[PDB]
Amino acid sequence: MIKAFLIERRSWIAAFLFQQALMLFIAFVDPSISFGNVLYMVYLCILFFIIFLWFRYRKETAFYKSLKTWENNLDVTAINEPETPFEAMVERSIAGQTEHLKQTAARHRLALENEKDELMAWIHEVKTPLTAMHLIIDRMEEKALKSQLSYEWLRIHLLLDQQLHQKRISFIENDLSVEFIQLQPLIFKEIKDLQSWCIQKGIGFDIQLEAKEVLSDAKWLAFIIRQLLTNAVKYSEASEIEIKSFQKGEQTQLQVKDCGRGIDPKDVPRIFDKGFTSTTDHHDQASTGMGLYLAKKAAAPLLIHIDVESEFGAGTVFTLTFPIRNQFEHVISV
Amino acid sequence: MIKAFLIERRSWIAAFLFQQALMLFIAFVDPSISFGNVLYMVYLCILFFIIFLWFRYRKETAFYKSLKTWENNLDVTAINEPETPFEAMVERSIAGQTEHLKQTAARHRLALENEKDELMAWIHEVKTPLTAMHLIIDRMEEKALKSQLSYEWLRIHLLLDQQLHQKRISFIENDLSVEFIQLQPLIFKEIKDLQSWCIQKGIGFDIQLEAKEVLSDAKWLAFIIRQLLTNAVKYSEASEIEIKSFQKGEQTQLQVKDCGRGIDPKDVPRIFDKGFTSTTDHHDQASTGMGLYLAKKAAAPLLIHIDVESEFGAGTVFTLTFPIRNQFEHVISV
Amino acid sequence: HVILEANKIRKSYGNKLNKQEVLKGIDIHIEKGEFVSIMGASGSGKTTLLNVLSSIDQVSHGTIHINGNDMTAMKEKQLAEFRKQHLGFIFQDYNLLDTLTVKENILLPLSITKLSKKEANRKFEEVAKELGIYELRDKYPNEISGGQKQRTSAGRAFIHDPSIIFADEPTGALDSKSASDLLNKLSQLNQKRNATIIMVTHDPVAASYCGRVIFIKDGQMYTQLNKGGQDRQTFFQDIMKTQGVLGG
Amino acid sequence: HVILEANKIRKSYGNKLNKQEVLKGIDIHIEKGEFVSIMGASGSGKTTLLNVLSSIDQVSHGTIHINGNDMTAMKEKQLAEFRKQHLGFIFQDYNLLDTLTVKENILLPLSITKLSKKEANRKFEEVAKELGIYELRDKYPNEISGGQKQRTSAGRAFIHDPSIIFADEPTGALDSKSASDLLNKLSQLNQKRNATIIMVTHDPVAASYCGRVIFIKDGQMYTQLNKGGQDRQTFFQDIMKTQGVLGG
Amino acid sequence: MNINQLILRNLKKNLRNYYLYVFALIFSVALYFAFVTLQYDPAINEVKASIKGAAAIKTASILLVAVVAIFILYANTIFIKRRSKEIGLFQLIGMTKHKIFRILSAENVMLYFGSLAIGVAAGFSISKLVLMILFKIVDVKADAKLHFSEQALVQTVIVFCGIYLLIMIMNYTFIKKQSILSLFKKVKKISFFQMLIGALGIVLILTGYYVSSELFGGKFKTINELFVAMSFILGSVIIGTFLFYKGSVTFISNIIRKSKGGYLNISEVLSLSSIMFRMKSNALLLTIITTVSALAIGLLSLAYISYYSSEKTAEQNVAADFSFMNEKDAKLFENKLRESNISFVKKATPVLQANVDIANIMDGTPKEMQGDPGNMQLAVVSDKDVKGVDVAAGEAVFSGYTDLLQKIMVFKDSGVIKVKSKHETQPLKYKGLREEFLVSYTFTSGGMPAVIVDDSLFKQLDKDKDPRIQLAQSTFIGVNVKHDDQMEKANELFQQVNKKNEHLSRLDTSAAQKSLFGMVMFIVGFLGLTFLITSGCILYFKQMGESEDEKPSYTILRKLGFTQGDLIKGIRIKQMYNFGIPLVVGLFHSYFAVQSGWFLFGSEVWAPMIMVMVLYTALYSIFGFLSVLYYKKVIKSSL
Ligand SMILES: CCCCCCCC/C=C\CCCCCCCC(=O)O[C@H](COC(=O)CCCCCCCCCCCCCCC)COP(=O)(O)OCCN
Ligand SMILES: Nc1ncnc2c1ncn2[C@@H]1O[C@H](COP(=O)(O)OP(=O)(O)OP(O)(O)=S)[C@@H](O)[C@H]1O
Ligand SMILES: Nc1ncnc2c1ncn2[C@@H]1O[C@H](COP(=O)(O)OP(=O)(O)OP(O)(O)=S)[C@@H](O)[C@H]1O
C-alpha cells in the first residue's frame, strides 16, 4: 500500500524538492550568502522530511484499508471512527446508504407481513362458512347422499386444516408445548372423525396400543396422525388399516399400516418431496400432496421421525417415533 | 470547502513553513549570512508555495464535493470519475453497496410475485370445491333445508366473488373490453343466480327496459348489477324490485327501485366508502360493505357514475349513468 | 426465435424541476430475419428508444435481453465491446470520415479482427458490387453525390454481418429516386443475407417496404400491422388508413 | 394585397466538378394575412426554400419582391436592416440564453431599439399573457419544461411587431398535447395582428391548422388546397387524400 | 436589460475557461518588464566594457517586442474561436456587427488590463535575481538592490497598448466573417507537381549539408569563393526547408499509406490521415521556428567560445606581463616598484626583423596570395635567450599558432625557410613548434611567429644589419613579474603610473573581453530561452484547436463502440509524430550551424552544445504531454 501512498502524494514531494533547489540556486548566485551552510540545512531537512513521511504514512493509511477490509465481510464493525472531514463525508455517505437500504427492507418486510396476515384472515373467513354449512346440514336422514356430503366436507375441512397448519409452521417453534398425551383417546377421536370415509369405502380399523403415554405436542401430533390416516384411507380401497404402537428400547414408536395399493419403490423416497403427486393415476393430480411434507417438517422440532416402509402392491407403513422424555429437558431449559 | 482542505493538510503546511522559520532564525546567529539577502529567499519561496496550494486545492476538492452533493438530495449518479487510488477504493465500496441494495430489491420483487402466484393457486383450489359442492347438492328433495343450504351457498359465493374482484382490481385496467351486450339476458342470468334469496324473501323482479343495449364490460357491469340487486334484497323484505332502463338524454341509465327500509340521509354518500357499514340495524354486522365500493371503483374506468337516492322508510335507488357513445374512442388515439 | 426482448422499459430526462418521462412501459418482441419499422411523429421517443435498445443510453427501469444476454448488468466497457462486434448502425446524417476513401471507410470495422488481406479484399468487393459503388473505391467523400455516401454507409454497416442493424431514418436527406433506390437495395440485402433490421421513420412510403409496422405515440405502442401476401401498394394504403385514425 | 412574390428561383449546391441542383423553377404568390404552409417529405428542398425566401442565402437565378422592394439588388447592410425590421424567425430548436431569465431573454431584441422601459414592459406583459407563460418570468430556462421553452422562443418573435414570420417546423421537439396547444396559440395570434406566418412542415396533422397548403415534390410545387368552410376534420382528410397520391 | 449587465454576466460565467490566456499575458508582461528595467538601472554602468551596456539592451528590446507580439496574437485564438454560435444568435436577433464587436471586445479589455496589472507586480519581484545573474556572469562584486525604474513601466504600458490595436484588428475580421448560418453548422488526391516538390526539398537540404560539410574539411581557402559558397549554402538550406514542410511530408506519407491496400486500423486513421493533410497547411511557421532556433543556438555557442578564449588572446596580444613604449616610463615604473618590494625581471630582448621566404612553404592554392608571398615583417631570435629550443645551423622554429592564419595558410611538412636578405640567403629547416610571440601586437601587426636559429647564425644575421624593414624599438621593453604573489598591487601601481592609459597589461585586458562577451552571451541566452518557450507554447496552442473540429469525429465511432483507451492510444502516436519532426530537423540544423563556430575560432569544445540540446527536448516533451492530456479531456466528453 506504500506504493499507492507514494503515487498519491508525488506533488508535495516534488514541491519540496523544488523549494530546496530554489534555495540552493539563490544561495549560489548571491555573494553575501555562503554555499556551505545551505548544503547542511538541505541535508538535515531531507532526513527530517523522510522521518516525517514515515510518520505521515503511519497516521494516514488506516481508514481506507479498514474500509477495503469491511466491504467484503459479514460484519459492519470493521470501519474506524472519522478523523478528518474527508473521511467524515465518506462515512456519512455510507451511513446514509445503509440506512436507506435498512428502511427499504423494513418497509417491504412489514408490508409483506401485513399481506400475509390478510391472507391468513381470509383463510379464516373461508373456513368458517364451511363449519356453518356443516352445522346447518347435519340434519339429513338419507344414507348415501349424507355419506357423500360428509366425505366432501371432511376433504375440504382437512384441506383447510392443512392450510392453517402450513401457515402456523412458521411460528410452531415458539408454540411448542410439552405435556402428557394419552394415545387411546386421540386415536379414538381420529377414528371417529373419519367414520364417514370408512363407512363409504368399507375400510376397517384396529386399535391395539401397547404404549398408552407419549410426550409431544397434542395439536401437531393429532394433525400428523390425522393426515396419515387420511392418506391411508384415500389411497386404499376396502383395506384393513391397522394402528400399532410398541415401546422399543428407550423410544416410543407408533406405526400406521394399510393394505392398499401402496407406493411404487421408485417414488417411495419422493413422497416426502414438497408438492409431490403420483403420476400413475390422474385422479391424484388434483390432490395437494402437502400434508405429508407438513407433518415431516413439523415433526423435526418435536424430534419425531416420520419414516416410511412402502411396498408396491402391499401398502405403506408410516412410523412415528416419539423422542425420549429425557430429551425434552433441553427444550424446557431453553 | 476551504476550511476542510486547510485543516486536513496542516502537517504539510507546518513542515513547509518550518524550514523558512529555521533559515530566518539561523540568519541572526551567523555573521557570514545576511538577513536582508535571506528575506528575499523567504519571500520567493512563500510566493511559489501559495501558488502551488491554489493549484492543488481545485484539483483535490472535487470528488468529495461530488460525493457531498450525492449524499441525500437527488441525482443518484452525481459521483464523478475517480483518478487517485484513494478515490477508487471508495467508489468500489459505493458500487458494492448499491449493487447489494439493487439485488435485495429484486429479491423483494420476486418474493411479491411468488406470493401472488401462490395466492392465485390457492384461489383456484378454493374455487374448485365450491362448484363441486354446489353440483353435489343440486339434487336435494326437501324444501326448507334446501332453501337454507342454497342461501348459505349463495352468501359464500357472493363473498368469494367480492374477494376475487377485490384482488382483480389491480389488473381490471387491462381487462376492460367493449362489445355489444343485451341487458335482458344478463338480468335474467342474475335473477337465476339469485333465485333462492328472492324465493325465501318473496321478492319479485320487474323488467321494463326501454333500452336493452349498454356500452360497458360484461363481467364488471354484471358484478355491479349483482351487487346492487343483493344490497336491495338485503335492504328490502317481501317487496318487488323494479328494474328499468331509460335514455337520459345522450347518457343511458339503468334504474333499480325497492320498498326497503332505506338509508338515512346522514350516511348516503358514505355507503360507497371502503369497508363502510350501517350501525342502525343489528344484523348489518355481517356485511363488510365491499360490494358498493368495488362497484363504484370499477365504474370509474368505464366512465360510469353511480347515483344514489335513498330515503329512510322508502328504499334505495341506484342509477348507472352510462357515458356517451362518442366517448369510447380515445383509447386508440390518446 | 426471439432475438430482442424488452419488458416494461422506462426512461426520463432532467432532474428536480425539469424531470420529464419519455418511455412509459414498452414491450418489444423482435424475431430473427424480420424487417420491422416503428413509425410515429416527431415528438415521440423514437431516437430515445433506438438509443436505449442498442445500449447507447441507460434505462431507468425495465429489462432488455439481446440474443439471450442480459444487458442491464454490463457497466460501460462490456456494453461498448458488445456494440463494437454484434451490432450495426446507419444514421440519417454524417457517418463517413472525411479523410478516408470509400474502401478505407467500409473496411474499418474489419481491422479489429485482422482477416488477412485477400480475405478482406474479397469481402469488400462482394458487398461493393451489390450496391454499385465498386468504381468509386478510390474517391474521397467530397467527390461523390448524396445517395452514394448513404450506400457506402450501408455497405460499411453490412460488411461484418451483425445480429441486429439499427437504422434511423436512412432516407431523410435524399430525393425520391435516390431514396427509392436505397430502400430497394436495403430490402434485397435483407432478403439475400438473413439480417434483422430495426428502422424508425415518420414516412409511410419508407415504411411500406417492411413486413411489420408498430405505431408509437407518447412512449406507448398500441397498433400492429402485418403485410402478408399484399403487395406494396395495398400495404401503403392500409398504413395510410391506420395513420388517419391516430391523428384525427 | 400581395406581400411576397417569388418568380422562377433556382439554387444549386456544389462547385465546378460536383454540382447538384435543388430548386428548379418555382413560382410563389403569397397574400397578406394568410397562414400558409408547405408540405413535403424530407429531402424535397424545404429549408433551402425558406433560407432563400428569408433573404439568408443567395439564389443562382430569379428575383424575389417582398412588399415591393427588390431583394436580389441590395448590399449586406441594407439586407441587415430590412431583415431586422420586416422579418421574424422561429426554428425547431429553441435558441435561448441560459444566463438570462425568461423575461429579459424575450426582451433582448427590444432593449436595443432605444425604447422607453414602460412601453417594452407593457408589450412583454401583453405577449406573455396572450401566450400564458407570465408566471414563469423570474425562472431561469433550466427550471422549466420543453413546452414552456418553446413558447418563450415563439413569443420572442412576436414582440418587435414584424410583418412576416418565417417558421421552420416548430413542434418537432414536443409531444402531442404541447404541439396542439402551440399550434392553437399561433393560429390565435394570427387572427388578432395580421402576421403572414409561413410554416414549413412534413406533418399532415400540423398543416391542417392553416388556410392554404402547397405541395412540393423535388424543387417544384405541384398542387394547392383552400380551406373554405371545412372544420379541420374534413380539411385533414382532404390533406391525407392528396398526400397519399403524391407519396405512392 | 442593460447591455453592461449582459457583458458582466458573460465575463463572470466565462472566466473559468480563460486561464491559459491570462497566464500567457502575465508571462509576457513579466519578461518584458524584467528585461527592460536593467536598461535604466544606474548599477549597470559598473560593467566596464568596450560598448556602453545600456545601448545593446535597446536593440534587444526591439527584438523582444517582435518576439512577444506574435505570441500574444496566436494566444488570442483561445479567446476568439469559441464564440461562433454566439455571434450567429446575436445576428439572428437583429444586432449589427458594430455592436457584436463592442460586446465581445468590452471584456477582452478587462482581462487584458487585469493581466497587465498583475504581470507588473510579478516582474518587479524577480528584477533583482536577473541583475544578480548578470553581475555573476561578468564577475562584478558590487551589491544589487531593488529598484522600480518607472521609465520601464511607462515603456511597457505603451508597448502593450500598441499591441492591443493589432488584437482589436484581428478580432474585427473574425467577427466580420461570420454569418447567420453559423447557428446551425480541401482533401484531394496528390498530383504530380507535389510528387516533384517533395523530392526537390530533400535534394536541396542534402546538397546544402554536403556542401557545408566540405567547407569544414579545408577546401575553399580564399575569401572570394568563401562568400559564394556561404550564400549558396544558406539559400539552399532555407529553400529546402520550405519545400520539406510543404510537399515532402505528404510525399512520404502517401508512399507509406499506399503500401497498405486500403486496410488501416484506428491508430493509423488517427495518426497518418491527419499528418498527411494538416501539416502542409503550416509551412511558413515551422520553417521560421526551426531556422531561428538553430541560429540562436549557434550564436550562443560562438559567444561562449569567445568568452572562455579570453586569457590566451590577452597573453598573445601583450607579449610581456606589462608593456611600454618609452624607456623613461618603464624606468619610472621600476622606481615605483622599488618600494613595492617585488622583483622585476624586465628583459629588453633584442630581436632582429629579418625577412624570409615562406612562399614555397605555403600549401594552399595559387589564387591565395595574402599580399606579398614572402615579404612579411618576420623576425628571428637567437639561441642565448630561448635556450630550450636549441637550433643548429640552417634551421628554424616558428613561435606561434594563430588559428586564423592556420586555417588559411598551410605550412609545408618539410618547407625551407630561406632568409631573403638584401644579398645573402639563409635557408632554414623546421624541427619544432612554439606559440610564444616575442613582441606585442603593436609591433608585430598581424603576428609574426618568432624564429629560433643558431646563436652564431643570429650573430651573422645581426652583424649583417640589413637596411630594410625593422622594428622602431628593436629591444622590446616589457617588464615581467615573479611568481604570482602580489599581482593586484602591481597592476594598481601600473594604473597609477600612466594616467593617460597609453600602455598595456595582461590582467587588464584579460577583463575587457570577458566583460563584453559575457554580456553578449547573457543577451543571447535571454532571447533564446524566451523564443524557445514561446515557439513550443504556440505549437501547443495550435494543437488545442484540431480537437474541436474533430469533436464530432470523437463523438461518432464511440456510438459504434471503440472505448476511450483505444482512441487515446492513437493520439499518443500522433503527438509523437507531430512534435518530433521539427525537433529532429532543428537539432540537425543546430549541429551543422555550431560546427562553423569552432571551424575558425578554435578547435572543439563539445561542452555546451550537449547541455543546450537537452532543454530543447525537455520542453518539447512537456508540451506534447500537455497536448495529450487536452485531447484525452476532449475525447472523454464526446458521448
Ligand atoms: C522565461 C525566460 C527567463 C530567462 C531569464 C534567465 C536569466 C538570463 C538567462 C540565461 C543566461 C545564460 C548564461 C550563459 C551561459 C552561462 C555559462 C557561463 O557563463 O559560465 C560560467 C557560469 O555562469 C554562471 O555562474 C551563471 C549560472 C546560471 C546561468 C543560467 C541561469 C538560468 C536561469 C533560468 C531559470 C532561472 C530563472 C531566472 C529568472 C527568474 C560563468 O563563470 P562563473 O561560474 O560565474 O565564475 C566561476 C567562479 N565561481
Ligand atoms: N449546405 C448544403 N450543402 C450541400 N448540400 C446541401 C446543403 N443543404 C442541403 N443540401 C442538400 O439539399 C437537399 C435538400 O435538403 P434540404 O434543403 O434541407 O431540404 P429539407 O430536408 O426539406 O429541409 P429540412 O432541413 O429537412 S426542414 C439534400 O439532398 C441535402 O443533402
Ligand atoms: N438530451 C435530452 N434532454 C432533454 N430532453 C430530451 C433529450 N433528448 C430528447 N429529449 C426529449 O425527448 C423527446 C422525444 O425524444 P426524441 O429523441 O426527440 O424523439 P424523436 O424526435 O422522435 O427522434 P428523431 O430525432 O426525430 S428520429 C424530445 O421531444 C425531447 O423533448
DSSP symbols for chain D: -EEEEEEEEEEEEEETTEEEEEEEEEEEEEETT--EEEE--TTSSHHHHHHHHTTSS--SEEEEEETTEESTT--HHHHHHHHHHHEEEE-SS----TTS-HHHHHTTGGGSS---HHHHHHHHHHHHHHHT-GGGTTS-TTSS-HHHHHHHHHHHTTSS--SEEEE--TTTTS-HHHHHHHHHHHHHHHHHS--EEEEEE--TTTGGGSSEEEEESSSSEEEEEE-TT--SSHHHHHHHHHHHHHH-
Are C166 and C87 contacting, i.e. CB atoms less than 8 angstroms apart? Answer: yes
The DSSP output letter for E248 is: I
State the cell numbers at E5: 449587465
- Cα–Cα distances (Å) from E413 to E268, E361, E417, E436, in that order, read 61, 8, 12, 21
D114 exposure class (CB count in 10 Å sphere: 0-12, 13-18, 19+): exposed
Q: Contact C184/D224 with Cβ under 8 angstroms?
A: no
- How many degrees, rounded to 5, is the angle at CA D34 between CA D32 and CA D39? 130
- β-pairing, C20-31 vs C2-13, is antiparallel
Q: Is the Cβ pair E560, C104 closer than 8 Å?
A: no
Chain B touched by A159 (CB under 8 Å) = yes
**Among E448, E523, E503, residue whose Cα is nearest residue E44:** E523
End-to-end CA distance of chain B: 51
| Nearest residue to C108 (alpha-carbon basis) of C89, C91, C92, C129 | C89
| Cα-Cα-Cα-Cα dihedral sign, residues A207, A210, A213, A218 | negative
**Phi, psi dihedral angles at C135 (to 5 degrees):** -85, -5
* Residue carrying the nine cell digits 535571506: B38
C-alpha grid cell for residue B39? 528575506
- Residue E44 CB neighbour total at 10 angstroms: 18
Sign of dihedral through CA atoms E57, E58, E59, E62?
positive
Cα C178 from chain centroid (whole Å): 18
| Closest of C28, C48, C32 to residue C165, by C-alpha | C32
- The secondary structure element, H or E, covering residue C129 is none
Where is chain D broken, named by the residue before each break, C–N > 2.5 Å?
Answer: none
Do the Cβ atoms of C99 and E264 come closer than 8 Å? no
Per 3-state DSSP, chain E is made up of helix, strand and coil in percentages (nearest 5) of 65, 5, 30
Chains E and A touch (3+ CB pairs under 8 A): yes
- Specify the amino acid at residue E406: Q
The C-alpha cell 394419552 sits at A182
Nearest Cα neighbor of B117 from B49, B167, B177, B42 is B167
Specify burial of residue D40 (Cβ count, 10 A radius: 0-12, 13-18, 19+): buried
Round to whole Å and give the CA distance between C140 and C101. Answer: 5
- Is ligand 1 within 6 A of the CB of residue E525? yes
Given resolution (angstroms): 3.1
Q: Check pocket membership of C94 for ligand 3, CB cut-off 6 A.
A: no
Closest to D51 in 3D by CA, of D3, D89, D14: D89
Q: Using CA atoms, how far apart are residues E614 and E598, in angstroms rounded to an integer? A: 21
Question: What SS3 state is found at B179?
Answer: coil
Q: Which three cell numbers stand for residue A93?
A: 455517505
- The Cα diameter of chain B in Å comes to 134
The dihedral through the CA atoms of D79, D84, D86, D89 has a sign that is: positive
Compute the distance between CA of residue B239 and CA of residue B248 in angstroms, rounded to an integer. 26
CA-closest candidate to residue B34, choices A19, E144, A48: E144
Distance CA A307, CA B162 (A): 44
What technique determined this structure?
Answer: cryo-EM
> What's the grid cell of residue A61?
493509511
The helix (H) or strand (E) run that includes residue E51 is none
Task: Note whether D173 contacts C143, CB cutoff 8 Å.
Answer: no
Sign of the four-CA dihedral D21, D27, D29, D35: negative
Give me ligand 3 centre to Cα C13, in Å: 9
DSSP state for residue E388 in the 8-state scheme: S
Check if D205 has its Cβ closer than 6 Å to any atom of ligand 3: no
Residue pair D213/D225 in contact by the 8 Å Cβ criterion: yes
Cβ(D231)–Cβ(D58) below 8 Å: no
The radius of gyration of chain C from alpha carbons, rounded to an integer in Å, stands at: 19
Class of domain C2-246: alpha beta
Q: Is the Cβ–Cβ distance between D49 and D224 less than 8 Å?
A: no
Q: Is B139 exposed, middle or buried (0-12, 13-18, 19+ CB in 10 A)?
A: exposed
In this complex, is the C-beta atom of C248 within 8 Å of any C-beta atom belonging to chain B? Answer: yes
Kindly give, in sequence order, each residue whose CB lies less than 8 Å from that of residue C40, ignoring residues fewer than 6 positions away: C46, C200, C202, C215, C216, C217
Neighbour-count burial of A115, counting CB atoms closer than 10 A to its CB (0-12 exposed, 13-18 middle, 19+ buried):
middle
Question: In CATH, what class is D2-247?
Answer: alpha beta
CA distance E438 to E381: 9
* Calpha distance E362→E374 (Å, rounded): 10
CB contact under 8 A, C109 and E553: no
Q: Which of E253, E440, E273 is nearest to E351 (CA)?
A: E440
D72 lines ligand 2 (CB under 6 A): no
CA pseudo-torsion sign E98, E101, E104, E106: negative
Closest Cα partner for D225 from D217, C202, D54, D234? D234
**Longest Cα separation, chain E:** 110
CA distance E526 to E303: 13
- Would you tell me how many other CB atoms lie within 10 Å of the CB of residue B111? 13
Q: Does E96 touch chain D (CB under 8 A)?
A: yes
Would you call A318 helix, strand, or coil by DSSP? strand
Cβ pair C15:B332 closer than 8 A: no
D204 CA to middle of ligand 2, Å? 21
Q: Is B252 helix (H, G, I), strand (E, B) or coil?
A: strand
* D56 CB-near residues (< 8 Å, 6+ apart): E180, E181
CB contact under 8 A, C223 and B333: no
Is D60 assigned to a binding site? no
The upper half-sphere exposure of residue C44, i.e. CA atoms within 13 Å in the direction of its Cβ, equals: 20
Instruction: Of E382, E385, E466, give the one whose Cα is nearest residue E419.
Output: E466
- CB contacts of E129 in chain B (<8 Å) are 44
Distance CA D148, CA D9 (A): 37
The neighbouring-strand residues paired with C225 are: C213
Distance CA(B278)–CA(B281), nearest Å, equals 7
**Chain D residue closest to C172 (CA)?**
D42
Is the CB–ligand 2 distance for residue D45 below 6 Å? yes
Q: How far is CA E158 from the centre of its chain?
A: 29
Tell me the chain E residues in contact with residue A29 when contact means C-beta distances shorter than 8 Å.
129, 132-133, 136
Q: Rounded to the nearest 5°, which phi and psi values hold at E357? A: -105, 120
Report CB contact under 8 Å: B43, E128. Answer: no
**Is C246 touching B (CB cutoff 8 A)?**
yes
Instruction: Name residue, grid cell 425434552.
Output: A328
Contact between D32 and D1 (Cβ < 8 Å): yes
D208 marked ligand binding residue: no
D48 lines ligand 2 (CB under 6 A): yes
Note whether D156 and D105 are within 8 A (CB): yes
Atom index in ligand 1 nearest the CA of residue E137 equals 45
B208 Cβ partners below 8 Å, 6+ apart? B242, B243, B244
**Helices within chain C (DSSP H only):** 46-53, 77-86, 102-106, 118-128, 146-158, 176-192, 204-207, 232-247
E519 membership: H or E segment, kind and range: helix E506-546
**Please, what's the b/e burial string for B27-57 (b: 16 or more CB within 10 A of its CB; e: otherwise)?**
beeeeebeeebbebbbebbeeebeebbeebe
CA distance C175 to C183: 12
Nearest to residue A27, comparing CAs of E43, E129, B21?
E129
Q: Residue A151's CB: how many other CB atoms inside 10 A?
A: 19
Q: What's the CA-to-centroid distance between E457 and ligand 1, angstroms?
A: 55
On the 0-12 / 13-18 / 19+ scale of CB atoms within 10 A, B140 is: middle
Chains in touch with D (3+ beta-carbon pairs under 8 Å) read C, E
| CB-based contacts of D218, cutoff 8 Å, min separation 6 | C175, C176, D24, D44, D45
DSSP secondary structure letter of residue E209: H
Cβ contact A190:A222 at 8 Å: yes
Q: Measuring CA to CA, which residue among C40, C45, C41 is closest to residue C25?
A: C45
Subunits in contact with chain E (3 or more CB pairs closer than 8 Å): A, B, C, D
Selected residues 183-202 of chain A with any CB under 8 Å from a CB in chain E = none
Q: Which chains touch B (3 or more CB pairs under 8 A)?
A: A, C, E
Whole-number Å distance, alpha carbon C170 to ligand 2 midpoint, is 14
Among C147, C32, C156, smallest CA distance to C100 is for C156
**Residue B229: what residue type?**
L
Q: In what order do the strands lie in the sheet with A315-322?
A: A205-209, A241-248, A251-257, A315-322, A305-311
Torsion angles phi and psi, residue A215, rounded to 5? -120, 110
Buried b (16+ CB within 10 A) or exposed e, E93-126: bbbebeebbebbbbbbeebbeebbeebbeebbee
Amino acid identity of residue E606, one-letter, is W
DSSP-derived secondary structure letter, A283: G
DSSP state of E245: I
**The C-alpha cell of E499 is what?**
594616467
Going by C-alpha positions, the residue among E319, E335, E267 that lies closest to residue E570 is E267
Distance CA A163, CA A290 (A): 9
**What are the E-state strand segments in A94-225?**
179-182, 205-209, 213-216
Distance of CA E425 to the CA centre of its chain: 51
**Ligand (nearest to CA of D217):** 2
Q: How far is CA E331 from the centre of its chain?
A: 47
Regarding the beta carbon of E299 and ligand 1, being less than 6 Å apart is answered: no
User: Which of C20, C47, C199 has most ligand 3 atoms within 8 Å of CB, for mutation?
Assistant: C47
Task: Give whole-number Cα distances, A117 to C80, E457, E635, in Å.
Answer: 48, 140, 57
In terms of residue numbers, what domain contains A149?
Answer: 143-333
H-type alpha helices, B71-84: none
D20 lines ligand 2 (CB under 6 A): no
- How far, in Å, CA of E622 to CA of E96, rounded? 44
Q: Which residues are CB-contacts of B76 (< 8 A; sequence separation ≥ 6)?
A: B70
Neighbouring C-alpha atoms within 13 Å toward the C-beta of B149: 22
Look up residue A323 and give its three cell numbers: 423422542
Q: Are B322 and B251 in contact (CB under 8 A)?
A: yes
d(CA E174, CA A212): 111
CA distances from A67 to A58, A104, B106, E46, E397 (A): 16, 24, 26, 67, 89
Q: What is the DSSP letter of C33?
A: T
Distance from residue D46's CA to the centre of ligand 2 (Å): 8
CA dist., res. B217 & res. B212, Å (int): 14
Strands C87-91 and C164-168: parallel
Do the beta carbons of residue A207 and residue A138 sit within 8 Å?
no
